[PDB]
Symmetry: C5
Subunit: 311 residues, 5 copies
């Protein structure tokens, strides 16, 4: 079966629509998401036109094999989508209404800069390759773009699912290609990061600062070194949930900066002990008293600077 | 093959039934479960009606290809179900009895608010889309809804498997969809959480309180910081078995609250040492004696408040 | 193609056999095992009778599509088995000898009560559903039940592979169903648990008891708290190799009980320090001396009681 | 299509060959390896004989469906191999030269006794099942056994890939079976185990022996208990890379033995403290001085005994 | 269908091209990467030649089944590629233009010597096998070799994707093979290794050197042993992201060398205590003062030597 011939030299418009049934498995490390959706395609094929008065029938149903169907592919999928043709309906003028239900694993890059207070625009790119006989162009039927009310993505809030109505028409290997951009806007639910990572991380940090109200070097060494080890555990935990980025993430910056606080607390604990052993506890007392204010003040100002730079 | 034509303008009723053979892999992080079951479908097709006397047969067996079969899909499935047609039997009046055995990975959301003492209602949503020629509506044959007595779900107790007999009829892309809700009620076997997480977590916490019967700052720092690190290990362990939720879970709240107890125990240990170094051990003795009562009492009252709020 | 017709009203006997080629992946958490085996089926189909003089062949070979083959399924599989038809041989009377090689992931519940000194009876349930025309019943050809001498299951000893010769015939959705029970008896190789979990766990426990020969509170706190943390690591390790059970496992009980020993050792260490600080070391000396005997004696008696209760 | 008929009562010889293209994924825990290779089969079928000067062609190419091909299977595969028929060439005398490219996951047992200084013999067992018309026997065409020079197996050295030319002919379910043993000899690259596990493990052990040059019980307890915990971490790490064995492996024995050294170091540290508290430091000094030598000596002697027993 | 016959005895040239659409999953441990691309093939088949004037058409479209297509395979793939034929266009002279979109998991070795500052040359080896009728040779159409500008490989920078235009011609299984080398040059984004592994690792190391400004053996033991344990955690973390190599990696060498620094710091801490207990603190003071300079100087020089040897 060949493509429909043009009336004049016009390209063949394939109107498209995606209706999300299910959203699942947003993998941060992989930068992938799985989707289960309806893909709708519509185009005119005058060769299929019929008289509804004569035929008695208002609509003609077809098997995919029986007619020409545009080969629509997804640009950003891991493997080709698993599709099930739901319906193919032809109206008297030859307008074909194709509907399939598919499942696909989509590769869409994520920006982790503001993690875990980040928002993402996930993409589903539809594409058609033109033939020698005629140029095929994609379009968006907005009446056929949407999502089921029950669509949920664990650990995320779904903001909107829209399509950039204007396709990207470009040449690729001496044939036209017509690409469409379906955008699924999501924002991470940061809630659980507060009681599970952020506040536990701050508690252990504040515990290390109790060494500024202690003259016991042995206890101080234990306080600062022990809490530093728990910070390393949190750093390891955080970096397991994320891919390696050529930029600093928000949490990454805080986590990194906190190492400097532990390092300076050790220097302080060391300086205090050395002075007290050298029979200079008055000087050690001044440094320890200043530290009590300096450490929380510098921590709060540093966080204000970071929050400003990232948001 | 076209759908059965209506006698009058009535929709076609497809009676359904699901009989669970196997239940497995309830994944909490994924919020999925795997099922292996019988799907039964029944509808009247008068074009298939026959005279038992002339034919000799009192039931006719068919191959799926030979006749029209309604395209039934599951809404909440990762990938389309793996089905195997077991039987298709037609009675003289044209009533078709279709049976298939399927396996599917079902996506059903879980409420972790009362974890690990939670109960869930897992869903299997059956759907059918109408055709241009006629509207298809779903029904429940209760005689064909059930589960094998041996059906077990590791870590869970199976309470019931029932169906909401009235479908949720709605329009989707200008065609009627008829959706049925099959509900599998389960309750989590919380038993193992008691010897493996809850009691070890309480033991380490109570160990931190032995610092209220010690004047040794160095030993106290060791007691409270060491047990805090073991609590972080339990928090990490717990959060690996669960997805990130935009709400507090029962265990999550207890785990979080216990951090405040460790924090205040460190403040106490610090205050006691500072006072004793300042030659004020009488005042330190009063704070330590009060702590011995205050810590267990406040812990027990806080847990009563939490248990009340969650149950 | 219809099933073979009866000579009289007798059901159709399908003789079965399973010959294990490979056993692998016994997953404790999943309660599954993977099997690669021969499935042999035999039944009479008089419609397939032939004269070897005419046909010029004593046995006829067929493609599965060419003839009626009973639809044999496995009850307890995750997904439908991967099968490859090896041979189909028809002798002149119409006796069909079907042979397939399959691989399947079998769901079979495990009893961890005596873990890791436990034994299991793994099951492979064969089933057939009757048709309108005639009742199909399963049987066991014992000459065709067995296992390759080289069949090994990593971490287990294979005791026997037998079949319960009498099928379970029962009605399911108004049709007879014929079930067969193939039983693979295995027993766990508990060896590696001794040098990797049990003995390391006892060594750290005995190390904590050296605190009963020390008057150094700071050293004692370190001894008991440090070894308790290593016990938590072993508990976490053990529970990762097992599913969450609504009962106590043997190892689980020992692991749990050992927490009580660590808890009481902390109480002792605390009591000893409090007394020595209160200038009562004579009383502390009595408690410490008693502990030296009490702790190992109570540990040994408690283990005798547990071993008795579990075996 | 039936098998080739015999000239006399001789069995049909199927000459075989395996040429490895890729080797990957040697999974120690699973005791599996993945292979991508050429499988070559050759046999005479006189029914396919032709006159080259009358047919014009010197060699005839066929589609698998067109001719009888022996059903060759692999004994030790997880799931049936993924095969792609590359070529089928028939020479004038009726000699068929079949070539396929396959990929398979091979289940082959491993001997961890000398790990990580172990060598293995991986197996790929080829098998054919005879038919009623004639017995099929396997043979090895050595000219068609080999491996690509670039074949690498990460973490292993590939020594040789040979075939035991004599097949194992045996009856199985009243038909002859002809098995062939293809052997892939490999030896593990132990190198990385030295800087990552062995030397770090020895460093921490030698660190624990610095307690033999210290009279500080509190410091000694810290030295020995801390390093013991790091040894537990290495033991856990090692046992994650290996399956559970009903025998001791080399690393396992060393790892186990080192626990006894930590245990005795604790006894020593305890004995030294008890004596010094009892005002017997002269006796404690003798035990500590003896320990300084006895420990490394016994350690190094015990290692010689182990190396001897294992190699 | 047979291959195209030669005009004279010339081989059949199959011009090839690969256009990368997506690059993903560079697995370091597996030494694999997943690719989604266009594979273009072109060859002359005079049997397909047509007169454009009498045919009406300037080009002819074909279904793969209708014509002879060269069987092109990939050498270094795990499983055979998943392909979807996009277009087959025949020009009047019989020149066939074949286009398929494929996805494959390519096995390509990585050199981790300079890790994580390493660069790789990933390979895709295209191959075709000759037939008895004629020799098939591969060529590169450079106009059809490329990559989409949006092609990203998480954690890597893509430098170039080129082809070695001259094929490798060798005999394998008594037929000539024509192999092409497609090279994807990448360089690892080392950025995240600095804040997550390298700097944390240096901070803990420098913390252990504060023991050179302390006379407290108990505190020193804590400082050096605690930080050593955190170094073991980083070593374990690093080795989980990498396969076992028969060579030292850059990070591996640094990580290994740092163990020697911890070992010598323990010797120093021990020597200092022994001397001070023996009433020789003046000598201990000299060793501690020298260590303060020696340790950072030797660390910096050792790193200069290592950086030189590796880069
Ligand atoms: C009488 C002193 C009360 C101290 C209360 C401390 C509250 C800390 C609030 C943290 C909020 C998040 C923050 C880290 C420092 C903790 C304070 C150290 C104890 C001071 C002891 C001095 C004895 C007179
Ligand atoms: C007055 C001393 C200031 C301390 C400055 C420390 C600089 C550290 C720079 C790190 C750069 C990366 C190297 C780790 C040792 C740190 C110094 C120990 C404290 C010195 C105490 C002396 C008390 C008088
Ligand atoms: C240590 C410091 C703790 C981290 C502080 C939170 C970061 C933050 O302030 O995050 C900010 C984000 C919201 O930012 P947004 O609306 O998504 O960005 C868009 C805004 N623009 C366009 C103006 C740039 O979350 C919150 O509202 C934070 C609430 C949780 C506080 C957790 C306290 C513990
Ligand atoms: C510190 C924390 C202490 C332990 C918290 C236990 C919470 C609890 O006992 O929770 C209660 C749940 C019951 O679950 P439910 O069926 O949903 O109750 C529904 C009730 N309504 C409908 C009125 C809301 O468990 C149990 O009764 C089992 C006993 C738990 C033993 C814990 C031992 C430690
Ligand atoms: C003679 C004192 C006996 C102490 C018994 C302690 C029982 C603890 C019960 C826990 C129940 C769950 C609970 C944490 C505090 C433990 C008690 C601290 C020891 C007191 C030493 C005083 C020395 C006279
Ligand atoms: C601390 C506690 C250490 C655990 C003690 C072993 C448990 C046990 O005695 O386990 C028993 C199992 C055998 O079980 P069985 O005889 O086959 O069961 C049959 C039970 N009847 C009689 C009820 C039917 O192990 C043995 O034969 C002993 C080897 C293990 C010794 C490990 C020493 C460390
Ligand atoms: C003057 C003493 C120099 C000590 C050098 C130690 C080298 C150890 C070589 C290990 C090789 C791997 C081996 C564990 C013991 C380490 C030695 C303890 C320090 C001795 C302090 C005595 C002070 C006089
Ligand atoms: C003279 C001291 C000999 C100590 C021998 C210890 C044998 C332990 C056997 C364990 C078998 C499994 C078992 C835990 C306690 C260990 C003993 C504590 C040391 C005693 C110091 C007394 C100094 C006089
Ligand atoms: C502490 C224990 C350290 C381990 C010592 C190596 C064990 C060994 O001796 O391993 C031996 C294997 C070689 O094995 P093979 O020659 O193939 O055995 C076959 C020989 N037969 C047939 C005679 C039995 O490795 C080596 O050559 C050791 C080199 C690395 C040493 C790492 C030291 C750190
Ligand atoms: C502890 C010491 C820390 C490690 C030092 C960085 C290693 C290095 O110097 O790495 C060098 C590589 C670049 O080398 P290249 O250009 O890819 O090799 C090709 C060069 N030839 C051809 C001449 C051999 O990274 C860098 O320039 C990154 C700088 C990061 C510094 C991190 C500081 C912490
Ligand atoms: Cl697609
Ligand atoms: Cl479905
Ligand atoms: Cl509606
Ligand atoms: Cl409708
Ligand atoms: Cl099955
Ligand atoms: Cl196979
Ligand atoms: Cl391929
Ligand atoms: Na079509
Ligand atoms: Na149908
Ligand atoms: Na300590
Ligand atoms: Na059949
Ligand atoms: Na064949
Ligand atoms: Na072809």
């Amino acid at each position: 079966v060949s493509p429909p011939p043009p009336i004049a030299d016009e390209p063949l418009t394939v109107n498209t629509g995606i209706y999300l049934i299910e959203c699942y498995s947003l993998d941060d490390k992989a930068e992938t998401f799985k989707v289960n959706a309806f893909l709708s395609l519509s185009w005119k094929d005058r060769r299929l036109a019929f008289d509804p008065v004569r035929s008695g029938v208002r609509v003609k149903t077809y098997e995919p094999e029986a007619i020409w169907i545009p080969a629509i592919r997804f640009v950003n999928v891991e493997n080709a989508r698993d599709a099930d043709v739901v319906d193919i309906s032809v109206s008297p003028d030859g307008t074909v209404q194709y509907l399939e239900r598919f499942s696909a694993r989509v590769l869409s890059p994520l920006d982790f800069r503001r993690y875990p207070f980040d928002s993402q625009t996930l993409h589903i790119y539809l594409i058609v390759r033109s033939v020698d006989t005629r140029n095929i162009v994609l379009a968006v039927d907005l009446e056929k773009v949407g999502k089921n009310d029950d669509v949920f993505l664990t650990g995320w809030d779904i903001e909107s699912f829209t399509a950039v109505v204007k396709p990207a028409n470009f040449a690729l290997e001496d044939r036209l290609e017509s690409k469409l951009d379906y955008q699924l806007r999501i924002s991470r639910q940061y809630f659980s990061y507060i009681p599970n990572i952020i506040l536990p991380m701050l508690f252990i940090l504040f515990i290390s600062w109790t060494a500024f109200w202690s003259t016991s070097y042995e206890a101080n060494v234990t306080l600062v070194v022990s809490t530093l080890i728990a910070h390393i555990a949190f750093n390891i935990l955080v970096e397991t949930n994320l891919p390696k980025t050529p930029y600093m993430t928000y949490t990454g910056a805080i986590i990194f900066m906190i190492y400097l606080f532990y390092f300076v607390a050790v220097i302080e604990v060391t300086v205090q002990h050395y002075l007290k052993v050298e029979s200079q506890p008055a000087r050690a007392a001044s440094i320890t008293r200043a530290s009590r204010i300096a450490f929380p003040v510098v921590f709060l100002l540093a966080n204000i600077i970071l929050a400003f730079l990232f948001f």
